[PDB]
Amino acid sequence: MHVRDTKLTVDDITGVVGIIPTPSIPTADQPGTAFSVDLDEAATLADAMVRGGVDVLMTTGTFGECASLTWDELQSFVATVVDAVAGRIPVFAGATTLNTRDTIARGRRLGELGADGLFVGRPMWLPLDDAGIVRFYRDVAEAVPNMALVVYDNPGAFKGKIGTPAYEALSQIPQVVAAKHLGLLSGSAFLSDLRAVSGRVRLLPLETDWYYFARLFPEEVTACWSGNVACGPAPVTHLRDLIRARRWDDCQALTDELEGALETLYPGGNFAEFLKYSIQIDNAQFQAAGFMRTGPTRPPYTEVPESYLAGGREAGKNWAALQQRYAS
Amino acid sequence: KLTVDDITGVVGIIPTPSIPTADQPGTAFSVDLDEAATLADAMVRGGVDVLMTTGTFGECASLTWDELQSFVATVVDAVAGRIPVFAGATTLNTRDTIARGRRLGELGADGLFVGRPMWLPLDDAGIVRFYRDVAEAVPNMALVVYDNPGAFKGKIGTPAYEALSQIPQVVAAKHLGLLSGSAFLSDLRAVSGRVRLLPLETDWYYFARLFPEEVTACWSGNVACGPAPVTHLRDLIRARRWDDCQALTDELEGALETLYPGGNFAEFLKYSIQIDNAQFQAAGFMRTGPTRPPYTEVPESYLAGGREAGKNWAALQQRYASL
Amino acid sequence: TKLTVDDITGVVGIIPTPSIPTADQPGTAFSVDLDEAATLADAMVRGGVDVLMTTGTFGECASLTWDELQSFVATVVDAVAGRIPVFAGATTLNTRDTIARGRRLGELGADGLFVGRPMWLPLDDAGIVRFYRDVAEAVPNMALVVYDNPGAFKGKIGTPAYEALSQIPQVVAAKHLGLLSGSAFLSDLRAVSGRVRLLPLETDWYYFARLFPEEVTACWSGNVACGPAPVTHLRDLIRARRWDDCQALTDELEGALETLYPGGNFAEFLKYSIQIDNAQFQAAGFMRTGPTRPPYTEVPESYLAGGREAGKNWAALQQRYASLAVSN
Amino acid sequence: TKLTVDDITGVVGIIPTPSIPTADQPGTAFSVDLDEAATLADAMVRGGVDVLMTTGTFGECASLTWDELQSFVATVVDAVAGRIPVFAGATTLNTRDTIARGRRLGELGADGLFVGRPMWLPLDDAGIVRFYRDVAEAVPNMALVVYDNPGAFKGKIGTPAYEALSQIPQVVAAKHLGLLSGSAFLSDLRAVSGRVRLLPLETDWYYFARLFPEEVTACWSGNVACGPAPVTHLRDLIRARRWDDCQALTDELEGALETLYPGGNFAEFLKYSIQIDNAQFQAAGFMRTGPTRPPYTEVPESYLAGGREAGKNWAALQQRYAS
Ligand SMILES: [Cl-]
Ligand SMILES: [Cl-]
């Protein structure tokens, strides 16, 4: 270990890894808007996640509009989130560009602004094979050794699922402490990737299947990721505590409740179609849940079949009732 | 300003020349600007009609902004007004593209060769809104629409082309030709002569003979291997020498057949930056270094295909430059 | 066989299999309207169709019983009475059953076989060549039309396969894709070097025929059973090099058929081509048929409406070009 | 029928169709080794297999003649002699041929049908339900195992189709995908609410049995013909809730089979699974069989080696646990 390296390890990734959206002002869908981040809501939201018991906070994944925020907006938003968290929990800043050098340059500045790590996708103009994927993450880790890294394994967004041999290599990179994974959406690969990282990387399933992997692999699968904490974090923190207590019957009933709340999200049950518009559908979910306030999404992802927003709003309202139940 | 009428003949697309350490993530500026100038001047003197920079194989993805603006400025200055210059500008969102497009126009580019954000795919409505936004924000810039289904996660719809043909700034589209045969003809009908739809150099003769009033231009990503084969193809089409066009077309397809690993189109697209770079090196018409991070990994045998294609084309360049 | 590539010229018409009103019931032992089949085949001869083909995809090659296929083919062959070549569509799950069906259809008087390939697993080019060579060697008295249908048979037939298929004497034509796969059409065309007739679409024929007049002397049409007059006229226009007329007619054909594809979605039409085409044949009123056979009976009603509207539009074209010989 | 979901417990073994040495010749009219068919089926009973099924994908349902399929199923049925339920695999291109095959198969003594669906056009969820309802109604004396193979039949059965299928008493079980489609396995599982046995793979049965001990009380295995002892032993460990042992043995089964997928590519294996599995059955030595039937005889030779290695690795596990 070097005094410059990140102090965070796989052991610090435990419990709920919450991913928040980037709150937006009412003119956020206009190309002429110079600055579209609602910074008051951002700070209140970040603080709400700490007080609600989120264990790790991440920003600006896909639905966080990593793609469409300006660099000025990304910096200001992350700095506001970091100041609001005040070091109480680790903060991973979502930084994904079209190439290795811009990602490195953004990652250094985000560390300067006090983020503890980076939630990093990968360039997607062309797909990267496994050798290309490992070289990218190693490049980022060597250039910014002071940042921990959460690997963004999103096959649709980045044009490919990260291979098991790539995970084995990623787990030798000390900065890599976690990966946002697919859970049962890629069930066989999740277990293959799990063996490949040998407890050196925390592989994060979904809130809707964390219990299944946690029971089967209690020593390894000790955290999940959730993009629904901004609808209210209480259903997921409670799942964390049910798992910790090994109340498997209670875990199953809560898990059924979460999937039930989210079922309307996918238009006509079509998951590939939800991914086509995940930014727009999630935004209507966050609005409807009423736990945070936000405006429209940013250019260019403003156009969506109106009926798809119906599924988002129902899912938000469904989750609101869960939040209210478990907020006690 | 530029209109559809200004896009005729060979629309050449050049790569971005690179210095020997271009493949290192710690290299801050990787463009060989002397080569960029020499290459652009060579395209003008070799008969290229319209010059475009920084599409996919131009490494629009992996250049830094400082690299892109300094490369565009050098190309525009070396061209010195002789032919139109379209700066390739493509980012992950509308607002960075507009901001890049404004500065690129301020640096003297005549237009923008624009692809669209692809983190999420855009539907026909989101695609039309993106190009309208750009055109309204940079009204002085003509626009070449970048229809690349694999890069941008979907083929631009015929209804989308219908709307794009109502935006005056949209003067041309880099299209797929026979790789999307039905769409090309459907799109060509939707734009109704208001947009120049550019097929491939290997497809151009077929579409020009069938639609001589509308398909009066193609694009070529091979001009940096030597533009003489394609400018010759242009003159043969203008003269309506269909036998000679067919024979030259077979020569062009013959030269490039090794570009595709096992003939597989889709494998080539996954590595088109790496494979094209090897072709430019071997053709020897220009010099360049390796590719930029992150696109430095590629099955070695795919590079052999690009090199042999580049050597094959260099032979065509020598044959047709002596006319 | 006596047939060669030279015998494949003009309009290769593919017809559906006419059905009785109870054809959609699984308890219907025999569902072919044999009277209408004979009327249909005769009208194809009388209307100028140059080659007749039966039981492709929309002809329900999959869902007819073996007894239905034998009887339908016998009726068609007898009504054609040697006036034009007849290719019986025979496609099963394996080489041996296809060979068995091929020999029997030859005994009932068909001149050749319109053959797709086994589809349970995809065949690679070696497997594709072996299959057709097997069929050709076991039934050498039957000419062959290769059914190149990527969706049905799980892949596009490769250009090296076409090179090998062009050394088999029985192989005289291929039902191809035209501009739906334009680069491959021209690759396959070079490969066969005039030994196989590569049949594009009726909407594509003019383009390929103008560019390659010595080779692309024929197309296939699955619309003849709505009335063959527009397609045979297109043949006559191409033979007269009336290119402006060819372009105008091609537009009229594509125009009549635009409502075939729901919301313009070609892929969605292909999931229900049997059901939609059946609606088209009914509405066009050139032939009479009942419903489709099990298992292909379920379809959104909206998709049927688009097929019927296509049928009515083609009927107007049939009325126009059928009377162009005698009118004003 | 008297068979219900309650009778589908333990190892559901799927066996291939033994072939004679000239089985790969299209002029061979009858290619089944019936003596080997009888010996294997008996060996499956004596080895602890709880349910036997024939003529799925690797059993070459596609490429056997009807006369072959009858004779093979009859021979298996006679050899089993009522000891365990036998599901005859019948999948044709249409409803009526499947039904008529299915009636004959019940007349030859099969207890039910292992049925995949017509695949020339893909069937949507309503067409899937109608197909299986039609078969169930035409031959109500026959229990049915639904064959959920998305590659073979052009689509994963939708969860709404499973909800409806679970109202058809004849439908007792489905050959499923386990962690290959884990999210859907669970959705389908909730939808059937214990009225249909959803069969995961032998390599993830332990995971699903531990989580759902009262529902997922059976798996399917396509490796029983390499020796059924490793899989019946897994059944016993699962019943005994010996989870540590279950995990280690699950790892052993995965380890023995890894050589099967060319360079770890599952989709590549599926393109040649009949050919590759054939190599594995020969190598394991538990049964003898000739080559595959037309048209699935072409396959890269290295893929076969990967199947041969898997056979030998499995034969070591068989010897270990047949102890
Ligand atoms: Cl002409
Ligand atoms: Cl337990």
Side-chain angles (χ1 to χ4, degrees), chain B residues 209 242, chain C residues 210 241 243:
Chain B
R209 178 175 184 179
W242 300 143
Chain C
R210 179 169 172 186
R241 298 183 99 249
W243 299 146

Side-chain angles (χ1 to χ4, degrees), chain C residues 59 61 104 125 182 186 202 220 229 241-242 246 248 298 316-317:
Chain C
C61 183
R104 173 48 175 179
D125 280 342
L186 287 198
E202 58 219 284
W220 71 263
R241 298 183 99 249
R242 296 166 62 181
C246 289
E298 302 282 355
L317 297 182

Side-chain angles (χ1 to χ4, degrees), chain C residues 149-204:
Chain C
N149 179 325
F153 309 128
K154 305 184 182 174
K156 176 72 185 63
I157 298 188
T159 299
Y162 267 106
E163 186 168 12
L165 292 175
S166 80
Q167 304 293 337
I168 305 177
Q170 288 67 20
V171 178
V172 303
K175 175 176 172 305
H176 208 287
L177 293 158
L179 285 171
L180 294 164
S181 190
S183 305
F185 186 80
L186 287 198
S187 301
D188 299 336
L189 189 65
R190 276 176 259 116
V192 302
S193 200
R195 286 180 304 270
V196 184
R197 192 71 71 207
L198 288 208
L199 305 168
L201 320 169
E202 58 219 284
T203 56
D204 304 357

Side-chain angles (χ1 to χ4, degrees), chain D:
Chain D
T1 177
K2 277 79 75 212
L3 280 186
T4 59
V5 56
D6 300 328
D7 302 293
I8 306 312
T9 77
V11 179
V12 184
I14 307 175
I15 55 154
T17 312
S19 64
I20 63 175
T22 57
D24 57 352
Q25 290 305 316
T28 297
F30 189 87
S31 64
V32 181
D33 189 326
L34 296 169
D35 282 335
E36 194 78 13
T39 283
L40 168 75
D42 184 59
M44 298 298 98
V45 180
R46 295 183 309 99
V49 168
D50 296 289
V51 176
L52 195 59
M53 319 208 295
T54 74
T55 44
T57 287
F58 68 87
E60 307 180 86
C61 191
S63 41
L64 301 172
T65 66
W66 178 223
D67 190 70
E68 274 173 340
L69 181 66
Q70 292 169 78
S71 295
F72 174 63
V73 164
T75 299
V76 170
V77 167
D78 297 346
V80 169
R83 287 176 287 182
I84 58 165
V86 179
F87 282 76
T91 301
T92 80
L93 283 172
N94 67 73
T95 322
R96 290 181 293 155
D97 284 344
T98 296
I99 284 169
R101 290 195 171 203
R103 282 195 184 111
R104 177 60 177 160
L105 293 166
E107 290 168 17
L108 297 169
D111 304 283
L113 311 176
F114 176 33
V115 171
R117 54 186 197 278
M119 83 290 291
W120 186 310
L121 262 51
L123 285 164
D124 63 16
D125 278 340
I128 291 171
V129 173
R130 165 90 62 178
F131 168 74
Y132 284 109
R133 192 180 309 282
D134 282 348
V135 173
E137 285 167 8
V139 61
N141 49 318
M142 293 274 90
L144 304 170
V145 176
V146 174
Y147 193 172
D148 195 349
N149 186 327
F153 314 126
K154 308 191 180 167
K156 170 89 184 65
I157 302 178
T159 301
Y162 269 104
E163 199 282 316
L165 291 165
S166 78
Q167 313 300 337
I168 305 173
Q170 278 89 9
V171 169
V172 301
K175 196 268 218 196
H176 213 291
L177 300 142
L179 287 190
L180 282 166
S181 197
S183 188
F185 182 87
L186 285 203
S187 301
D188 300 347
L189 187 70
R190 275 163 261 142
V192 298
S193 198
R195 297 183 291 275
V196 179
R197 191 79 62 222
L198 297 195
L199 287 303
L201 326 161
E202 69 220 323
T203 43
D204 47 49
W205 183 19
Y206 147 66
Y207 306 129
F208 292 113
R210 187 174 170 182
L211 294 172
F212 312 99
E214 317 201 310
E215 287 159 289
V216 187
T217 55
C219 82
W220 71 268
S221 174
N223 297 294
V224 288
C226 294
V231 191
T232 56
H233 181 52
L234 176 62
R235 172 203 62 215
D236 298 338
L237 289 175
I238 290 184
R239 169 143 279 179
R241 306 188 196 141
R242 292 174 48 183
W243 299 146
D244 289 331
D245 292 331
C246 283
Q247 181 69 70
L249 171 58
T250 295
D251 293 341
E252 294 191 4
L253 308 184
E254 183 210 298
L257 299 175
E258 61 174 52
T259 46
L260 214 44
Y261 322 89
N265 188 342
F266 188 64
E268 190 74 351
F269 157 86
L270 299 173
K271 289 204 309 190
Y272 302 95
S273 61
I274 291 174
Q275 301 92 321
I276 296 172
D277 289 347
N278 177 257
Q280 186 201 337
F281 297 125
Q282 293 170 332
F286 193 82
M287 63 139 76
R288 290 176 302 273
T289 184
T292 64
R293 279 89 174 188
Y296 299 112
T297 66
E298 303 284 341
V299 52
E301 212 274 321
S302 68
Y303 296 0
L304 294 188
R308 300 197 196 96
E309 230 178 303
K312 307 265 154 208
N313 289 333
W314 192 279
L317 298 189
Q318 157 73 16
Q319 160 182 9
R320 176 171 314 144
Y321 293 108
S323 187

